[PDB]
Ligand binder design. Structure first.
Ligand SMILES: CCCCC/C=C/C/C=C\CCCCCCCC(=O)O
Ligand SMILES: *[C@@H]1O[C@H](CO)[C@@H](O)[C@H](O)[C@H]1NC(C)=O
Ligand SMILES: *[C@@H]1O[C@H](CO)[C@@H](O)[C@H](O)[C@H]1NC(C)=O
Lengths: 50, 50
């Protein structure tokens, strides 16, 4: 909370508020770098070059 | 429509087009200042420092 601030944070299939008191079975993290106008393409049902 | 212009304006419960033709009961205004990427936390069902 006092180090990193996110311009985008959105969750699908769950709610963010419940994330504190819920336990997850298998978790994977995928990481990369895009430009700003492409950050809206990382979502289900989108089209574009990314 | 002449001086003040808003980057964010979102209504919950009603339609903005129906903001006219309608007459309200008990209106309260809460005012504060945040930074640029915290404005997306002022919504129902959000998590974060704000
Ligand atoms: C990367 C290790 C954890 C991986 C599994 C995560 C489980 C919990 C789900 C989401 C929490 C990730 C960080 C969310 C930060 C919110 C920041 C904010 O909105 O202000
Ligand atoms: C917040 O950041 C400052 C920066 O030095 C650090 O000293 C402090 O420990 C941080 N807060 C917490 C709770 O660690
Ligand atoms: C809108 O703003 C301009 C800026 O000075 C002003 O001249 C004009 O009278 C304003 N319109 C109205 C209806 O007051």
């Amino acid at each position: 909370y006092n180090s990193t601030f996110f311009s985008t944070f959105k969750c699908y299939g769950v709610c963010a508020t419940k994330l504190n008191d819920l336990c997850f079975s298998n978790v994977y993290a995928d990481s990369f770098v895009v430009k700003g106008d492409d950050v809206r393409q990382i979502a289900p049902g989108q089209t574009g070059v990314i």
